[PDB]
Amino acid sequence: MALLTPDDLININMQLQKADSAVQEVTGLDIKGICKALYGTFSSSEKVGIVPVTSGNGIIGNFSASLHAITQYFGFDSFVTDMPDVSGYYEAVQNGAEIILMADDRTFLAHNLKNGKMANNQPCTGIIYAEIASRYLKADSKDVLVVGLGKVGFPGAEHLVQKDFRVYGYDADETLLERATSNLGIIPFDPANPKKFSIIFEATPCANTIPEAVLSENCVLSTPGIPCAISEELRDKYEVQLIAEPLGIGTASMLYSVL
Numbered sequence: 001m002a003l004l005t006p007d008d009l010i011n012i013n014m015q016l017q018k019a020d021s022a023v024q025e026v027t028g029l030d031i032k033g034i035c036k037a038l039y040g041t042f043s044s045s046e047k048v049g050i051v052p053v054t055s056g057n058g059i060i061g062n063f064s065a066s067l068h069a070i071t072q073y074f075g076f077d078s079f080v081t082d083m084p085d086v087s088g089y090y091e092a093v094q095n096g097a098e099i100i101l102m103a104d105d106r107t108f109l110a111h112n113l114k115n116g117k118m119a120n121n122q123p124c125t126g127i128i129y130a131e132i133a134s135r136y137l138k139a140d141s142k143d144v145l146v147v148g149l150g151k152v153g154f155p156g157a158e159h160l161v162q163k164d165f166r167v168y169g170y171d172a173d174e175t176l177l178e179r180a181t182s183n184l185g186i187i188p189f190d191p192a193n194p195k196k197f198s199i200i201f202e203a204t205p206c207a208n209t210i211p212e213a214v215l216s217e218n219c220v221l222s223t224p225g226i227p228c229a230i231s232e233e234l235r236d237k238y239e240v241q242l243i244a245e246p247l248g249i250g251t252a253s254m255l256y257s258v259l
Ligand SMILES: NC(=O)C1=CN([C@@H]2O[C@H](COP(=O)(O)OP(=O)(O)OC[C@H]3O[C@@H](n4cnc5c(N)ncnc54)[C@H](O)[C@@H]3O)[C@@H](O)[C@H]2O)C=CC1
Pocket: 001, 002, 003, 004, 121, 122, 125, 147, 148, 149, 150, 151, 152, 153, 170, 171, 172, 173, 176, 203, 204, 205, 206, 208, 209, 223, 224, 225, 226, 227, 245, 246, 247, 248, 249, 250, 251
């Protein structure tokens, strides 16, 4: 388990703007366009109730405020409830929320009360970041390297397999790698025998997970992982096109998936 810190979420609007610019450079589409390609949906000022939750480690500084900003950015009529938890849920529904957005330490969900669709942050984040990686316009290859095969990584890899990409996967935990290979049919990546990729998807709570020998010039690294999968030095050396943002892209994926 690795949760967001208040420091991760400083100037969320600038982080989102930069991420959107990067996604547009890499794919030719903005985040809205990516969500449109994934789900066929667009926002129509749907009312979104954001409920703070005191469960477990409790309320995270900047979390609800960031969700407030993210939802407004994508054109939703969002609000944050005064009360937390069940009282907050009640408040949200009474105040006309169509979509409920809330998170404890284990689950971050979006529930559309109008159509009954419900999203989980983990697969939604994996899918969108993998989708963005795969749409790299100057890729020249359908080989994709997936580093990290957990809650976010596995559904990302699954998506890429469904989208007919040649998926190579690595996880430091042998069992997780074996599970991904036997359930998805991905190619197990051997770090001792590396090849260069133009498309990399990483979902790990660790730094320096992308070895130099894997990088090619101008390669895309699409990663929700925190901290950054690659050092500044390696990122600069190979002019890596980085898509990395702490909350907004995954939240967009959730919201557009329930429309
Ligand atoms: N930016 C965003 O919007 C979001 C970010 N996150 C962040 O994404 C990260 C991943 O989340 P989950 O998939 O839920 O975590 P997880 O713990 O379910 O999966 C992480 C996997 O990475 C593997 N791993 C660790 N070090 C490695 C290395 N050096 N090489 C290869 N594999 C390695 C672990 O064995 C584990 O299987 C976390 O840092 C989390 O905080 C999570 C949700 C949304």
